[PDB]
Chain A
């Protein structure tokens, strides 16, 4: 499975939300499908994501790289602490939950 390539497909086809603050808003107020958090996320940012995700009943996948490599896997030129996949437009990114 190519996490990045599917994320690029879901980036361009469906709806993916970039940034920790948008993700907390999309977890708290929206209904996302998959949350991806970088492995090297800080303690406050990690535990905020799991608690809102545990309340929201949304799964979390821990990306096997850092925030920088997560951003490169999504083709962005910056870092990405956490993202929400609201719509997998053509990708199989929802396979990561299992």
Chain B
């Protein structure tokens, strides 16, 4: 599943310390943090740069925005997003409703 490990992939830097449960939590969060995300503006599948916690930057379109601590968009945050970036979905409705 991972490059050189079976289950402890991102958290393999910790070795055999800190406990399986603690390291397992790190693997769960870190896999989404270090995965591929869609930029909320350009919708590219790109590895966003996390400047700090809650600060994300898209290397393609340069979009800098506030998100989750380790993931660019939390579950609740994905519903209260600004509607300026909800233009594709808005026109998607107006194509369907008008046709």
- Interface residues, chain A, with chain B CB atoms under 8 Å away: 1, 38-40, 42, 62-68
Does the CB pair B92–A40 fall under 8 Å? no
Partner of A65, one of B44, B85, B88, B99: B88
Binding site for A on B (CB under 8 A): 41-44, 61, 85, 87-88, 90-92, 94-96, 99
Q: CB distance B61 to A42 under 8 Å? A: yes
The answer to whether A64 and B91 touch (CB under 8 A), given A1-B99, A42-B61, is yes
In the assembled complex, 23 residue pairs joining A and B whose CB atoms fall closer than 8 Å, in A order, are A1-B99, A38-B88, A39-B87, A39-B88, A39-B90, A39-B91, A39-B92, A40-B41, A40-B42, A40-B43, A42-B41, A62-B91, A63-B91, A64-B88, A64-B92, A64-B96, A65-B88, A65-B92, A66-B42, A66-B88, A67-B43, A68-B43, A68-B44
